[PDB]
Design a protein around this ligand. Structure first.
Ligand SMILES: CC(C)(C)NC(=O)c1ccc2cc1OCCOCCNc1ccn3ncc-2c3n1
Length: 270
């Protein structure tokens, strides 16, 4: 991006009242562009994290946001500002929008429409070699609560650009020397994103987090070993294709998971 050094508050007024949202290292405040009147969402991101300069982390997010600028299901970046301590990303504001988590279950018809949107944005990122790694409701924005509007994906702080066939060739090295715990490893890939989409689909249709256990080692144990049954009362009014769609994503072996492309052709969404 072009990075502006003139004071942010000369072009924008900050809206009064509570912030939109607050991640670690970032605060989102609704604002108004003075000579315009238009609403935007201003993402204040500290450049320092645990004493270290992390400007490059903000630069990475801008780069992803820009890669995705013609993706209609990713939030638009309008402008970037820089102070000594902060960087400010001025992002588009969904007038009347909402985080999908505060909107709460959904009708199967509404999840079908919404998941096709999510999967098209994810599919677009994945063809750009970007894996999101944080697809969850806190990061899925609805342009309208009532009626249900369109999804925008809004944060990319855990996102990565991934390598191709080099992953399992030049990295692994000469096969006769590889240790057996490497052969058994599954690295973070585009299928990691699809697991999360399978978890969100489940949550969206039933109101149940499928692997939520009693403690955290239960939650972690359910993720590793629980074979879901889809036999809950909440599934009686759900279509067979909806359950097959989830079964296609919540596969433990990453290589067996459906890709976003195949999801978009699954009979459930077509
Ligand atoms: C990752 C982080 C939590 C810092 N979040 C973001 O990077 C973000 C970016 C833009 C908007 C909201 C964001 O965080 C979700 C909190 O939002 C609660 C709902 N309020 C509305 C209503 C309309 N809009 N329009 C844009 C955004 C927005 N949020």
């Amino acid at each position: 991006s072009m990075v502006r050094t003139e004071p942010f508050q000369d072009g924008y007024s900050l809206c009064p009242g509570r912030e939109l949202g607050r991640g670690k290292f970032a605060v989102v405040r609704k604002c108004i562009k003075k000579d315009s009147g238009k609403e935007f969402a201003a993402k204040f991101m500290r450049k320092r994290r645990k004493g270290q300069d992390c400007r490059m982390e903000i630069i990475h997010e801008i780069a992803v946001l820009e890669l995705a600028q013609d993706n209609p299901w990713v939030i638009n970046l309008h402008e970037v500002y820089e102070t000594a301590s902060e960087m400010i990303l001025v992002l588009e504001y969904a007038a009347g929008g909402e985080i999908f988590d505060q909107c709460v279950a959904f009708k199967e018809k509404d999840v079908q429409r919404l998941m096709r949107q999510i999967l098209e944005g994810v599919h677009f990122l994945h063809t750009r070699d970007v894996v999101h790694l944080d697809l969850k409701p806190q990061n899925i924005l609805l342009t309208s609560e009532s009626p249900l509007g369109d999804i925008k994906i809004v944060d990319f702080g855990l996102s990565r650009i991934l390598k191709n066939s080099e992953e399992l060739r030049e990295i692994m090295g000469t096969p006769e020397y590889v240790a057996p715990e490497i052969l058994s490893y599954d690295p973070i890939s585009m299928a990691t994103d699809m697991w999360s989409i399978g978890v969100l689909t489940y949550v969206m249709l039933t109101g149940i987090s499928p692997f939520l256990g009693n403690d955290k080692q239960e939650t972690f144990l359910n993720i590793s070993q629980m074979n879901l049954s889809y036999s809950e009362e909440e599934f009686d009014v759900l279509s067979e294709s909806a359950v097959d769609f989830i079964r296609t994503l919540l596969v433990k072996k990453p290589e067996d998971r459906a890709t976003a492309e195949e999801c978009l052709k699954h009979p459930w969404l077509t």
